[PDB]
Structure formats: structure tokens, C-alpha cells
Amino acid sequence: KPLVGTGMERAVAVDSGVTAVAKRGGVVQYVDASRIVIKVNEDEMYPGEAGIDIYNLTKYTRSNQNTCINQMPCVSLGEPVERGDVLADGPSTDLGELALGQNMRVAFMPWNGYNFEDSILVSERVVQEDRFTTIHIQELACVSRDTKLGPEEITADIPNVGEAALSKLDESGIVYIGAEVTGGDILVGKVTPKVKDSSLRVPNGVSGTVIDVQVFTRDGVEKDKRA
């Protein structure tokens, strides 16, 4: 929420569709992390259908730039809202106002050359408060192609590796949801006929948590247990 704004933050945040602006005013009935329910006022309720609004918030999902899109409710239970009020603030939005960065206590002074030409000097309090910490969601695809000399299987039986390396996989060769895989870990076990190891693995230097796994199967291929 920029301390020194220009007043255009709310217009930019609302007009761009990232928040959950209430379609019809009313009273908030239910608020969880991923859903908001609004009981519309009798004055704004059409004759006939009753007649309440359900806003399904889009939780952690990947943007085009591998950032995080995550709408958070900004209203409490039993709180009146009117037409055109934000109910959930998306990414880089605070109570319906555009909020890109964070406002921090700055001092203009040379400091032993650590801000020599154009550099910044940052305290450990900024990194402890986790205020410039960002979430980056990455999508990695493993495809089994109908190649010559035999097709590709997504089994967990992989040579040249031990059982400690395959312990993070399930019985179907796909990593569990929530496993803290790091660089070099095997996400999706896949082998190609000659057999050789061609499994999808995390790129080196990349850590993180597997948050969602999607399996797409062509028609008539007898999807495995995990699918």
C-alpha cells in the first residue's frame, strides 16, 4: 500500500482484472481462502432467482512470467459490501489499491562504497521480514512420445539409480504433491527403449515444492494408477 501514491492505484487495480470486485452489493455470508459468498441485498435482487453471488478465488497459479497469481480475501464474515467494492485483492494489490513494491526506511548517504555507483545497501531486517520474498511457479513437462523401436513408459523402474533417489516418487513414477525436490531430483520417471534413463528431473540449482501435478493421456492408452 504505497505511502506516497497518486490516487490512480485503485483505478489501475480495479480496472485490470485481478481482484474480485463485487457484482451486486450485499452482505458477506462466507469467507474462506478460496471462496467468497455474498447474500445480495433485497433492493439489488432481481425478481425471481435467489440470488446470491459466489466468487471462486484463483489461488496459487502460474502467470506468463512464472510469477505467482494468488487472490486473497479482504473482507470478513458478516461485513456489508456495496456494488463495485473489492472482495479479494490479487497479486500486487492491497485492499483494492495497486501495491507493487514495499515502502522501506531509506537513508541517502555513502556507506563505505557498498552503494558506490548505483548500488543499494540492504539490511538483514529486510531479508528477515521476508518482504521482498517472491514466489515463482514453474511448469515442467514430461512427454511420452510414440517413437520407433518402442514407446515410452512412465514407470518408476529406472536403472542406474538407487532407491533413495526414487523414494520421493509414488508407485507410478510421478513425484508426490508437496515433495521438497531440489536440483537433480527425479520428478517424473520415464524410460525410452533402445533401455536408457530419460526421466524428467529438476534443473540444477532449482529448488521448491511440487504444488500441483497434471496428467494428460491420449485416448485409449490405459492411463496408469496415478492418472
Next chain:
Amino acid sequence: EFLKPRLVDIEQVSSTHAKVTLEPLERGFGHTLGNALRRILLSSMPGCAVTEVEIDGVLHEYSTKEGVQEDILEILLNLKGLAVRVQGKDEVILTLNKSGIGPVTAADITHDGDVEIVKPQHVICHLTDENASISMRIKVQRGRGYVPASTRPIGRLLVDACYSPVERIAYNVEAARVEQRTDLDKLVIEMETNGTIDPEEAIRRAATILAEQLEAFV
């Protein structure tokens, strides 16, 4: 010779922040001791921060739980901000079980009589509907400094460790017109703790650290 300073007063203003006094001091020793103690206190003080959490129906911190409006990541942030004092142990596992509409604060944690929560009003999350219940296990452990999860079951959520009770330390050197002698200094140390460290104990530990570091060449 050099008069020896001693802890003459501890003015505890509020629960969080306190104001200690050292008197007397010779010329220049006020600033020397003030800055040395301020750096020691801001650097090395034992704390009892949270390290691991385990919510039952939650696999990873980037998910949501039905009936709780906070995201699991926001719950982990609120737990990271939790101030707690453990006395007889180094690590301890607090248990939180709460159901029904309302704010789940820190007062709902199982007492664990050797472990004291110093801010019972600290809201951890919110439960929206009556048929919702949360049950989590919070690993509060003793440490020093700031240890992120990058340095150190698929259902265990690791939080960044911030075992530093003090939040703000300031010192002021004033003139202590006492003992029928002028040009003597008095050091007033205003410290802002989270409530889990007694100011006299903080000053004592800070002086002990300096005394131990000075043993390299004396």
C-alpha cells in the same frame, strides 16, 4: 582509578520494552560500553522461535484449508511472528486444536506448563464456519541469530527461524552528577524485546559475551 559501572536500575516501562541504567562511567567509556552492548544485544541473544509446523490436512504451504480464510503461507508467517519462552528444554512441540467460528489466537495452544506464551492475543488464523477444525503441531526450539530454511514426511512445513528476542536497542550517555564528583557518565539503555528476555538478563549475557571474547589476549 576507573570506577566500576553497575546495574543500578531497571525501569520496566511495558512488557515488551524496558530501560536499564549503568552508573558510573568514566569519560568515553559510556559510548564504548553502549555501542559494544548494543551490537552484542542486536547480534547474539538466545531465542525460542518456531522452526517447523505440521497442519494435519495440509501437504504444502502453497495450499488452502476449508473454513480458514488465511492461506497456509500466511498462517506460517503468523506463526513465525509468535513469541514464546521455553525454560527447561531446548526444543518442544506445542499443540494447537481449535474448532468453530472465530480467531485462532496463541492462547488456544496447549499450555505445556514449562512453555509460556507471552502474547496470548497474537492471532494465528481465522476460522470461518462452525464445522471447521484445525490441528497443528508447532516445533518451538532454542537458537541464536537468524537461520533461514534454505540453510538447514511431505506434510511438514518449515518456517524461517528468527531466534532474536530483541527488536530495537538504543543507548544514551548522560551526566551522572553523583558521589560529589562531576564529569561522570551514566549509560541508559532502552531495549525493545518481544517479552521473552528479561532486560537484566539481556545486559548480563551481553557483558558475558564481551568478557569471553576478551579472553583471547588477557
Next chain:
Amino acid sequence: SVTEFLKPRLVDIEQVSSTHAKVTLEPLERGFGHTLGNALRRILLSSMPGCAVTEVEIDGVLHEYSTKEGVQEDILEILLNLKGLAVRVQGKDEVILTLNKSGIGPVTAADITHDGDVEIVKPQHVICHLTDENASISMRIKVQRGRGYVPASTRGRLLVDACYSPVERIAYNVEAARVEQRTDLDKLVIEMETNGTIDPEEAIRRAATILAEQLEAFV
């Protein structure tokens, strides 16, 4: 496990002529190099026991901006020469010494009367040069024990800036140290010169003793 820190040790003491030394300390805890170095530097250059020439009176000089026949230098330069006169005194606090000399040649520190318990560590320390034979230099320098540096502006007798502290220049330079796996640490480097009254290592040990005695009421 949260009480004991990386207590350092004197891993290197490289020195030059006995009025100069360079002492290294590693590996200190992250940030402790700066606090230890600042505390030691402040205690050494501000509050250290010592004795130095406090004020000198001349036979026929009544003002700092004056003259004396047969002397190459001026009163200001003789005051400067007397300020850097290293002197060591016994249990007595203050002592007045007399310097009388006639003849062509330099006047070193050994030319002061040898009677007394006061020891001069730099006998060849030139005080003044006189060019003629008729004129004779005669002065009384009163030295006293003090608590560091006290200039003459902080109030037939002339005032000299008293520099009691044995140190001349002290600097510290916190570098980066290394352990088997820990990286963010400190490597203190104290570089100290003295006037010759005491050893630089003795000065460091005395400063550590002072700083530890200041903390005996807490630990």
C-alpha cells in the same frame, strides 16, 4: 549449544621496530570484529594510563609566540619536540625536570639531568638546536600522569598539549575469515604504534584488562 561462540586466538603477530606491531584475530563471530576493534581502539586512544610532559617554563620566554637568541628553532617547535618526549615515571604522579645546556650542537633527551627515578626511553630525541656559544638554553619541564590526551586549550608558564596515552596510531580492519564450512565471519587486524614507553602487545593486553574490569560487575 547457543552459549559458546567462536572464541578467537592470536593467530599472527607480525611486527616492525618495537614501537610498532600488527596483531590478527580469527575467526571471530560475524560482526564481533567491529565491536572488539572499536572498543579496543577507543580504550587505547582515549583512556590509558601514562605520563607525559605537561608544561614547560623557560628562563626568559613569556609567550608562546616569542623568540630566544641563539636558538635555531622557535618556541612552537620546542613545544612540539617536548610533546613527543617519551617519559616513564614511578609511583609518584608529577615530577619537574630541569634542562640546562650551553654550547654548539643539538640538545637530545639524554641531556636532561639524570638524577631521579624518571626514565627516558628515547635518549637521542632532539629537543632544540642552538648555534652560538654565549647563549645557554635553560628550561623546566613538568610532567604528570594522566588519562589519555588533554590539549592545552582545555584550561611565564607555557602550556603543552599532554599526550599521556602510550599509543600513537591505532587502526583496525575487519576482513573476512573462513572455517571448515562457515563463511560469514570476521578477521580483526589491529595495527598499533607506541611512543616506546610500553610494548604494543603490552598496550593491547592493558586495554583488554581495562575493558574486562569494566564488565566484572555483570558477568
Next chain:
Amino acid sequence: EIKELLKLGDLPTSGQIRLYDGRTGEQFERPVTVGYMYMLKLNHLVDDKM
């Protein structure tokens, strides 16, 4: 108006406060300009550039 709003709090009109060095503890002369600036983190991260 900025000066008046600073004066509404207990803050100096000039916008500069005396600041003390963290390491040595000595005060910086020439009071420095302190305030709150709204800093942004651009999408140019060193772990994606190394």
C-alpha cells in the same frame, strides 16, 4: 505542505535527522536525509542471470 505535515508529527522540517554509525557508534555529521521510499523488486534476479 510537506514541511507542515512533517511538523504535524515530531519530525524535523528539513527532513534530515542526525544518524549514528552502526559499527563505530560515532555520529555522522552533516545530518542525512532519512525517509520512507517505495522500493520495487524488478524481475531481474541474479539466480536467473548467473
Next chain:
Amino acid sequence: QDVVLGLYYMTRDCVNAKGEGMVLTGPKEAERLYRSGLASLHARVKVRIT
């Protein structure tokens, strides 16, 4: 840019400061006076330069 600013501020003078006109026995005494607060960084003094 920062080195030149530091060297310009250090090698400078003002009409009246702490320790104006005092006589110094060398650069070491000048540093010992500045670091102890008994003299300003830019104060006109007579030093002995070899």
C-alpha cells in the same frame, strides 16, 4: 565518485572549527585527534610534515 567526494570533504577547511590553530607533531597526532573528537576533520592547524 565516492572516493573523490570523501577526499574532497577530508582535504578541506572552514573558517573556524574544533581545534583551530593548534600545533600538531605529525599526521599520527592529527588522526588521533580526529578519531577522539578533539578536533574537526577540516580545521586549520600547523602540523610537522617530513
